Subunit: 173 residues, 4 copies
């Protein structure tokens, strides 16, 4: 847990995958051509906290949806990359647009397109529903599953590692 905290302490960008991370991985369709996606309410509040403690937020996702666009904006997530399977490339790109390198990125994913990004990121994170290969290259596995607070969980972990957890807690005490 020592080495976990170093990696997190130095994080400047938090980059999330969507399906399996911000959601439980359910891809929903109905009979009139409309897709649906479910997100988790405590995730948003934890992401609002990291936003405001200086850390910038991004989404890199293989699919493309209005739901993701819609959710990211209300959460103050700023960089929205959709229809991108090549995750490490996308991550590196942001690093150079924002002037902080790979060492300064956190990234969280559940599945194979994610592994290289979770491997090279300064702080790579997977979840219990992530395949075994992505988990093995991760610096941290969440207690919680995607769509059920894994994102909020790492949100707190980084805030703890940056010493902004107590300030964030005190705001609501």
């Amino acid at each position: 847990m020592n080495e976990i905290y170093q990696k997190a302490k130095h994080i400047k960008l938090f980059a999330m995958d969507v399906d399996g991370i911000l959601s439980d991985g359910q891809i929903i369709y109905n009979s009139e051509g409309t897709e649906t996606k479910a997100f988790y309410v405590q995730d948003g509040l934890g992401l609002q906290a990291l936003k405001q403690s200086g850390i910038i937020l991004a989404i890199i996702t293989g699919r493309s949806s209005a739901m993701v666009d819609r959710r990211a904006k209300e959460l103050g997530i700023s960089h929205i990359i959709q229809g991108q399977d090549d995750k490490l490339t996308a991550l590196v790109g942001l690093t150079k647009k924002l002037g902080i390198e790979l060492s300064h990125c956190a990234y969280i994913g559940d599945d194979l397109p994610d592994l290289k990004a979770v491997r090279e990121a300064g702080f790579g994170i997977s979840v219990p529903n992530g395949c075994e290969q992505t988990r093995a290259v991760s610096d941290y596995i969440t207690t919680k599953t995607g769509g059920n607070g894994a994102v909020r969980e790492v949100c707190e972990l980084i805030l703890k590692a940056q010493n902004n957890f107590d300030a964030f807690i005190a705001t609501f005490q």
Copy 2:
């Protein structure tokens, strides 16, 4: 048992958070622009019993939708405060608007905005899926999770504390 019963026994007003308490915390979006939210049937029954026992019911949530409006109104929940993250201030307002006292209020919530209100209501309640900071400040933690009968459970428990449970049960025999 009793250190928790006398807290519940002089409750006049029962106020609730929505997301994580009335629902399981899923924020559901779709590619048409429609939001969706799921509630639990047995919660309806519990609340109706509470209202019929003499208890005023309230909703204080930080989000805003028709769904909460629909649900509240079928359940005869008279005070519906939406779009409001500062729960304690809204709860005191009710206390004054209605001429009650914080001592006679029950507040249930699952996350940080709820902390002060859960803390300052005479009978504070949270849930297993709840924040550890919000839990550490509550007088009771439900066994059921939000959107799975946490609310019904606490309706049953308040009714017991008032000696109205057996009568309520008896209505259906």
Copy 3:
């Protein structure tokens, strides 16, 4: 409790279901366009059709009221659909007088207090792991599978086994 349950299920002619908490897991779902959604379980479908095919009359008795229930009820051959009814025991007896059969031959399943009297008086009353304590204490049988997750299928199989239609029912797919 083990072999007396066999006896009550063998003479069932009418099988009547609560919806929310029984056919569905009890999620009541609304959206911003004003639309209501409800979920049902696929294996319950197949179990109903099989009960129906063995000569059993099927009935829905629910306190809420929606098109989803009418839509589901149609596809499954459920002929008697009573919606917007909290007074279950009396709607059931109403069916039982309309079909001219007694409560002894009526199976009823419910999960909550409104279903209590019906589960109690029915010839064979069933509850679920997720029903309240009171309606359960009153059931002749409690399912292993939860509402919306097979509770109906499980009781269907049960009635067929107690009717020597089970092994014939499996045979059709063997």
Copy 4:
């Protein structure tokens, strides 16, 4: 662990039930007459993988919807058969039309309509949520449930049977 490794190995056709396998079995309806079905994101990648190793994919399903044909088209499943409970007929019908043996078909089912098709396929699979009889007639039962990575799991098993797994992982390392 074997029996299965040998029993798979010579699979050219992989055919799947939908309700209970690709989904968790919830049949979802709404008040505008709209029907919804959920699929699982990690199964998708699993299916592309098998399809990429040279294996032909098929759905055979008792019901019929836009959701299934949509999800099949995006996942490149080529043979989609709806409105058919006679799954052993249609699969045999597929084994002739395409020139494959049955011993080379793998088939996954969860309920009685799938019993025959599972039993007599070269490699027969069921899930934990499947009924007694269909499970007792299967060669392999997934650990993960229908609509939660059961399809993904067999996708990995087959690729590992055909010594094609490590190639797939490597693509992402």
